Amino acid sequence: SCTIDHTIHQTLAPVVYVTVLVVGFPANCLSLYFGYLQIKARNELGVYLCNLTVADLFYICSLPFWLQYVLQHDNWSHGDLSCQVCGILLYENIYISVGFLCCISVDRYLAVAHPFRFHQFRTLKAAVGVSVVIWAKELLTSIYFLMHEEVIEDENQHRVCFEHYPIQAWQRAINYYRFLVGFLFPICLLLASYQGILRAVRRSHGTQKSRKDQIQRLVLSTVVIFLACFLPYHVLLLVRSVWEASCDFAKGVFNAYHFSLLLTSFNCVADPVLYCFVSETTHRDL
Numbered sequence: 455s456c457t458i459d460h461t462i463h464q465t466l467a468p469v470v471y472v473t474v475l476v477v478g479f480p481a482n483c484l485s486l487y488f489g490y491l492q493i494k495a496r497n498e499l500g501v502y503l504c505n506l507t508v509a510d511l512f513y514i515c516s517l518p519f520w521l522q523y524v525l526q527h528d529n530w531s532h533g534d535l536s537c538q539v540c541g542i543l544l545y546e547n548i549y550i551s552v553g554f555l556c557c558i559s560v561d562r563y564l565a566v567a568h569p570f571r572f573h574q575f576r577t578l579k580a581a582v583g584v585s586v587v588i589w590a591k592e593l594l595t596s597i598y599f600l601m602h603e604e605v606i607e608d609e610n611q612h613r614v615c616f617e618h619y620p621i622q623a624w625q626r627a628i629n630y631y632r633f634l635v636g637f638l639f640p641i642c643l644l645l646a647s648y649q650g651i652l653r654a655v656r657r658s659h660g661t662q663k664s665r666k667d668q669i670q671r672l673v674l675s676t677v678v679i680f681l682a683c684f685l686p687y688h689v690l691l692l693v694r695s696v697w698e699a700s701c702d703f704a705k706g707v708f709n710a711y712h713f714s715l716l717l718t719s720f721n722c723v724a725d726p727v728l729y730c731f732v733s734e735t736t737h738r739d740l
Contacts, residue, residue, distance in 0.1 A: 456619050456701045457609050458708050460528075467524045470716055471517050478722045482510050485726035488736055498561060501581035503729060505588070506554040509547065510722045516543040517719075520615075528612030530605075538600055541616035546595055548684075551721055552640045553588045555680070558729070563647040567654045619704050621695065629695040637688045644680070648673050672732065679724050687714035 486507045493500025519540045523530050530537060564572050574580070602624070606614055618625070655661065655669055690710050698707060730736055 455609075456704060458619055458705055460708065460712075462709050463712055464524065464527070466713075467716060468521065470719065471521045471524065474719055474723060475514060475517050475521070478510070478514055478726075481723065481726045482507050482514065485730040486511075488730045488739070491739060492735075496578070498576050498578060498581050499558065501578065501585055502554050502557050502561070505585050506551060506558075506725060506729070509550040509554070510725060513543055513547050513551075513719075514722055516540045516547075520544065523615060528608060528610070528614070530613035530615050534605065537605060537613075537615045541604070542596055542599055545616060546599070547592070548718060548721065549636050550588060550592055551725065552636060552684075553591075555725075556640050556643045557584060557588075559644050559647040563650050567650050619708075620701055621699055621704075626695050629691055633688050633692055637684060641681075644677060648677060672728075676728050679728065683718055683721050683724065687718045690714045 486504065489500050489504035489507055493504060519532060519536065522532075561576065564576060604616060604618070606618065608614065621629075652670065652673060655666055658666075690707065691714075694704075694707060694711055698704070
C-alpha cells in the first residue's frame with residue numbers, strides 16, 4: 455500500500471537500456487569469436503572467456519522485455535511467467551560474471567607468480583570442471599526464486615515485476631548473504647591476486663621500464679571499473695536491508711536503489727573491452 459513514484463525510473467532507463475543493447479550485442483559476439491580462437495590453440499583462459507561472454511549475452515537478451523516494461527507505464531504485459539525468468543537474468547545473473555572474473559584472476563596469478571608449479575591446475579579439464587560447478591550454482595539458484603509467487607497489482611492497475619517495496623522478511627537474509635558472498639569474497643580474491651601479480655612484475659628483469667607501467671594501468675583500470683560498477687549497488691542494498699524498512703523510509707531511497715541497479719548493467723560493455731580487445735593478440739587478428 456505504498457505507491458511509490460518512479461519518475462526517474464521512466465526517464466533515464468530507456469536511454470541506458472538501448473545504448474547497452476546496441477553497444478553490447480556485436481561487442482560480445484566478437485568477443486565470443488576471439489574466445490573460440492583462443493580455446494582452439496590450447497589455452498586455458500578460452501573456457502573462461504567463452505563462458506563469461508555467454509553469461510553476458512544471456513543478460514543482454516533479457517533487456518528487451520525490461521525495455522518494453524519501461525516503455526509502458528508501470529505495466530508488464532507478457533504473461534504471468536518470464537517475470538520469474540527475466541528477473542533472474544537481471545538480478546542474480548550478474549554473479550556468474552564475477553565468478554569468472556575471479557577465475558581469470560587466479561589463473562593469471564598462478565601463471566605469473568608461480569610459473570614452475572601447479573601445472574595440473576591450468577589444464578582444459580580443470581577449466582571445464584570449474585565452469586560446470588559455477589553453472590550448477592546458477593542452476594540451483596535458478597531452481598530457487600520460483601517457490602515464491604512474485605507479482606503484485608498497483609492501486610492504479612499495473613504489474614510490477616520483481617520488486618516488493620516494504621521489503622519482505624524472506625528477502626532480508628538473501629540480501630545479507632548476497633552482499634557477503636558476492637562482494638566481500640570476490641573483491642578480496644581480486645585484490646590479493648592482483649597485488650601478487652604487480653609485485654612479481656615489478657621484481658622482474660627482462661621487462662622494460664615502459665611495460666610495467668602499462669600492466670599497472672590495465673590492472674588498476676580493471677579493479678576500478680569493477681568497483682564503480684558494483685559497489686554502490688551493494689552499499690545501497692545493505693542500507694535498505696538493515697535499518698531502512700518503514701514505508702516512509704522506503705519512499706525515500708527508491709531513487710538511490712534503482713540508480714545503483716541501473717548502473718550495475720555496464721558490466722556487459724566493460725568485460726569484452728577489458729578482456730578481449732586491449733591485447734596484442736586481439737589486434738593481431740583484425
